[PDB]
Amino acid sequence: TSILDIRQGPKEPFRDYVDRFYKTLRAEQASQEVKNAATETLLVQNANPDCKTILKALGPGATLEEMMTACQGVGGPGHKARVL
């Protein structure tokens, strides 16, 4: 029931990931250093690796739209041969 549980699933869309992130955040919006703790940085940090890279390129203060746009860009399943 922690924000950690909020991760960027493989088959899970970024939207669902954000919903969870914001769901847990609002579940107990608080931390030992919320100020120092950049929520956005948490989502990105708690986000996949590639997304992290894409988010890194994004900017130190991208918008949800930009975050979702980059996430949507992230690679994935793109072929016939059923992925492992």
Curated annotation (Swiss-Prot):
Protein's name in the database: Capsid protein p24
Subcellular location: Virion
First and last residues shown, out of full length: 280 to 363 of 1435
PTM text: Phosphorylated possibly by host MAPK1; this phosphorylation is necessary for Pin1-mediated virion uncoating.
Subunit structure: Homodimer; the homodimer further multimerizes as homohexamers or homopentamers. Interacts with human PPIA/CYPA; This interaction stabilizes the capsid. Interacts with human NUP153. Interacts with host PDZD8; this interaction stabilizes the capsid. Interacts with monkey TRIM5; this interaction destabilizes the capsid.
Stated role: Forms the conical core that encapsulates the genomic RNA-nucleocapsid complex in the virion. Most core are conical, with only 7% tubular. The core is constituted by capsid protein hexamer subunits. The core is disassembled soon after virion entry. Host restriction factors such as TRIM5-alpha or TRIMCyp bind retroviral capsids and cause premature capsid disassembly, leading to blocks in reverse transcription. Capsid restriction by TRIM5 is one of the factors which restricts HIV-1 to the human species. Host PIN1 apparently facilitates the virion uncoating.
Region (Dimerization/Multimerization of capsid protein p24): 1-84
Superkingdom to which the source organism belongs: Viruses
Organism: Human immunodeficiency virus type 1 group M subtype B (isolate NY5) (HIV-1)
